[PDB]
N, CA, C and O atoms as a MOPAC input file, in Angstrom:
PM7 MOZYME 1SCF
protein

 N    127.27000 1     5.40800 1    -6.15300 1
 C    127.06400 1     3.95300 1    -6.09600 1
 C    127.99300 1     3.20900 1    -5.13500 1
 O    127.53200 1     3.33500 1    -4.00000 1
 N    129.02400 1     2.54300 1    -5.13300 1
 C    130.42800 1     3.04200 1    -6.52900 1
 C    130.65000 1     4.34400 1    -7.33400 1
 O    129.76700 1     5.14500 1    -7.63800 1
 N    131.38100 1     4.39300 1    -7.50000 1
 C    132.74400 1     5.75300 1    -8.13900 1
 C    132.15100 1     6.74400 1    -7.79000 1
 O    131.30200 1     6.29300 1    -7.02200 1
 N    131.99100 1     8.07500 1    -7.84800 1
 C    130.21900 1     9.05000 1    -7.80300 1
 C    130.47000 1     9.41400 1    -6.44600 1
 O    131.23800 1    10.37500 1    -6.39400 1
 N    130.13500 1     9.03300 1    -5.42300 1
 C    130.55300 1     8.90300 1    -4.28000 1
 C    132.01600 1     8.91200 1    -3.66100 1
 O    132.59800 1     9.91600 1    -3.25100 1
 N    132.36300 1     7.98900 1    -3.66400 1
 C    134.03600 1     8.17900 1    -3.59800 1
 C    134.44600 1     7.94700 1    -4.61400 1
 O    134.46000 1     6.82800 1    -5.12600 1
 N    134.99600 1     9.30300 1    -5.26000 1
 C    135.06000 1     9.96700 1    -6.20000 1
 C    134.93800 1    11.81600 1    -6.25100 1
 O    135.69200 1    12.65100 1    -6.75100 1
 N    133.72500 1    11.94300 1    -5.54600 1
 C    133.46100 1    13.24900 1    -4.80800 1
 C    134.43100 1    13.79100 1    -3.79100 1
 O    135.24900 1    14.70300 1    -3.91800 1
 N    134.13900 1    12.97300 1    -2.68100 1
 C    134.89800 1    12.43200 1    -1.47400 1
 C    136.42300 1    12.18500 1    -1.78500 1
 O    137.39700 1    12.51000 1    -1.10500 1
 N    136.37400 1    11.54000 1    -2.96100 1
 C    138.15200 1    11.98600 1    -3.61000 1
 C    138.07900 1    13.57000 1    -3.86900 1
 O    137.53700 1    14.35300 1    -3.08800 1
 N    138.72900 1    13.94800 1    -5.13000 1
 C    138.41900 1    15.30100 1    -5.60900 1
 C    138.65600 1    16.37000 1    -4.48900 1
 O    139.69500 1    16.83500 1    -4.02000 1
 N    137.51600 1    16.56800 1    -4.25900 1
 C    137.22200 1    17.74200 1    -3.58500 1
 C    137.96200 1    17.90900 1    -2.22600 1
 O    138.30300 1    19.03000 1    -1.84800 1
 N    138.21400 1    16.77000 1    -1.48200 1
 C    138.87700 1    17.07600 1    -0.66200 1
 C    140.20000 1    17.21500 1    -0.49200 1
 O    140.59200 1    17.69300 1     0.57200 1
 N    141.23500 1    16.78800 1    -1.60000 1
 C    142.21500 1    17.12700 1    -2.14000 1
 C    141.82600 1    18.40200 1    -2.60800 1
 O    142.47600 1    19.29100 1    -2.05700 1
 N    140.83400 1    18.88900 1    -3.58900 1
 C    141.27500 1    19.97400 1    -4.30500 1
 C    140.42800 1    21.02800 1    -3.40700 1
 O    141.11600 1    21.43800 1    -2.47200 1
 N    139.20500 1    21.54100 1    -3.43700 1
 C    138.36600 1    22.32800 1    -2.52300 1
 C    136.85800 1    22.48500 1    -3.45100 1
 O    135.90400 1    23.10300 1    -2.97800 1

């Protein structure tokens, strides 16, 4: 939307 999206885009690219 909102969150879901960046949120993903957070996460994962910190973690893998």
């Amino acid at each position: 939307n909102y969150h879901l999206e960046n949120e993903v885009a957070r996460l994962k690219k910190l973690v893998g």
